[PDB]
Amino acid sequence: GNAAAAKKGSEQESVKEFLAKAKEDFLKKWETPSQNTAQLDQFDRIKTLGTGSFGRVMLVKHKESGNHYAMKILDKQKVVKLKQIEHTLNEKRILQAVNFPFLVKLEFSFKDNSNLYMVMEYVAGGEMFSHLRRIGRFSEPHARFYAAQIVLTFEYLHSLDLIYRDLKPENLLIDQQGYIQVTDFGFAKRVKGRTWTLCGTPEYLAPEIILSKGYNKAVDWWALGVLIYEMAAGYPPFFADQPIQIYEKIVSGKVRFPSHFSSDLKDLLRNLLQVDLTKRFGNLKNGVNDIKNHKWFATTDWIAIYQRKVEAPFIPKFKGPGDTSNFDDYEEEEIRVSINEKCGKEFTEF
């Protein structure tokens, strides 16, 4: 990291070695995934932290240790009905195999008659979404700090042949050190070729997803462009009341920037929000290096970000263990476990 600090390029062999060792670690766990590492009665359910169409996330307390966790609970019958079996299997298999400072850690997983359970590290600082909407927008150094963590995270994930496919402020948690923790791997997939599933979030969808063309990891780089724009502007580059109107704006090949955006920021965003795949940054011959070497990131010490040595723009308020002040309130519902096993064959490998 001093070597990198001295001159750019002298760390290329070192970064290559890091990712190679990281792939070895990942593949061992990918090929033989962990199963059934906890059970429901080992936790006290405290409060819902988030909801979805087929599940919810709850703050739980591990009875034996006293540690707090975020438990994702998925209704097996809901998953099947919404045709999300493979996606859910993808999520768990990938999560138990990855290891990076800006990804939320899966601690335990298990299933019962009714539900699938993924127990994650609890990140009390709340979603970036909540802070972004409240404050309005982040300054460029603020946004850059977060952007850099995503760049490194995507460099990691893509090296493992993983596509993330759901980047948005809602899926980015702020930890006690002010750093990003990426959550929700529901659409994550290990894929070497191109893929075709229409999934993600309307505002963040790359044109090639919308146009049903078939796509690769370049969609994550498009999504980064959307994220950086939304962080710095306070609103996304393409917004409307309905998804249909949003998709039309995305495919038009036209973006307008706020007057306060720096020249460097506008240039980076033109290169990330590029409809032409043969021109989009992150997808060229130099790959991620085109982004990391861009003028907007000139002040960014990439190794220091990874080592978490850079002072964060803000540290979220923490009222001790189990504090949910940084999360909104949700309707609480009793977790019901059936006496009959639901969808046993479908979720055998979970």
Partner: peptide, 20 residues
């Protein structure tokens, strides 16, 4: 302003993930 138009829109709250 674009900001005002955003705040007046129906998509300022948490955005659900979509799939077909």
């Amino acid at each position: 302003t674009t900001y005002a138009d955003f705040i007046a829109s129906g998509r300022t709250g948490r955005r659900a993930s979509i799939h077909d």
